[PDB]
Amino acid sequence: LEKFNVDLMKKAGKELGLSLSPNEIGCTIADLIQGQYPEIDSKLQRGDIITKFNGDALEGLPFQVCYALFKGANGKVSMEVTRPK
Amino acid sequence: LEKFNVDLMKKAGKELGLSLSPNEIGCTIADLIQGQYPEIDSKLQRGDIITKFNGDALEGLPFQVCYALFKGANGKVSMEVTRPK
Amino acid sequence: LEKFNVDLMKKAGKELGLSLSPNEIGCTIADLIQGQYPEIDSKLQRGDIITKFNGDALEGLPFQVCYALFKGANGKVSMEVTRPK
Amino acid sequence: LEKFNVDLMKKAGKELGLSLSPNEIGCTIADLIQGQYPEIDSKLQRGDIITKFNGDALEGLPFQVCYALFKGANGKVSMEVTRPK
């Protein structure tokens, strides 16, 4: 159960390229567009679960949060992630 | 200030047509499409703040929840609203 | 000097695919990703200038607005556009 | 409530590291990266509201301006800030 962090500087013109879906403990990465950020391409994989983003714990929040997690994202982007089996 | 509730039944393929933005106590209705739902044309206006959606209080949630508040919402939509003066 | 409107229902999972840059009277479409929305693919072209979005006139605003015009976009998306020569 | 100003000189390739969200009177600093700029480490905290940036008052501007407020900002960055209690 590897738990790690993903930290990057978001650029206004580059979307993170991540598609999420609700999960019991956060937001699962259901899909990922390769080539957006090196920090993502070097660490993240489908199935990994984002448990917190910029200080907010994502477990237990309305499921809609996952579908808009990165909307309005700017500057600092800090994620705590967990990878299932 | 006025506080009221809005309840409507979503029809498949008929979006609510509301565009929201973050507010201290919820999600402000920044823009709207006239003619989508009678319940909306009858009780909602730009500037109104949705404070609770389908049982979930919106104050305190990450601001981005306002960007996909209606995703996955089928059946009866229940909103609690506050209207400034 | 054709002036027209672009109206669509944004889907949480589909970005508009538009890249803007500052313009004297609004935000110019410097780049466009084909295949996102039919309303865009059937009307918009590079060089067209967005002069207003969801009730806000874009002329005279800080240039940064154009670089974040669609961040947080949800539900109703209504644009007024002008096409140069 | 406290009101103060923050002035710093951006260095090429060194992002400010601030992440903002919409606020009634400006752009709230939702998160931040410690160690980017001494001026930031010395006077800014989460919850502070940037009310004016490089001469532009932020209250009244489309809420999305908070999502790319620092793009194109090179040289001296000047901010007016309000801090709740």
Report resolution (Å) to 1 decimal. 2.0
Question: B51: closest CA among B24, B76, B77, B74?
Answer: B24
Question: Distance (Å) from the C-alpha of residue B77 to the closest C-alpha of chain D?
Answer: 26
Taking phi over 0 as left and psi of -120 to 50 as alpha, with beta for the rest, C55 belongs to left
B chain contacts of residue A63, beta-carbon cutoff 8 Å: 72
For testing contact with chain B, the best of D19, D28, D63 (most B CBs within 10 A): D63
**Contact assessment for residue D35 and residue D41, using Cβ atoms and an 8 Å cutoff:** yes
- Distance of alpha carbon B53 from its chain centroid, rounded? 7
* A32-64 burial code (b ≥16 CB/10 A, e <16): beeebbebbeebbeeebbbbbbbeeebeebbeb
Per the entry, the structure determination technique was: X-ray
Half-sphere exposure of B78 (CA within 13 A, CB side): 5
**H-run or E-run covering A64:** helix A64-68
**Contact assessment for residue D85 and residue D1, using Cβ atoms and an 8 Å cutoff:** yes
- Distance of alpha carbon C65 from its chain centroid, rounded? 12
CA dist., res. C50 & res. C69, Å (int): 10
Tokens of A15: 């979307």
Domains in chain D: ranges and CATH: 1-85 (2.30.42.10)
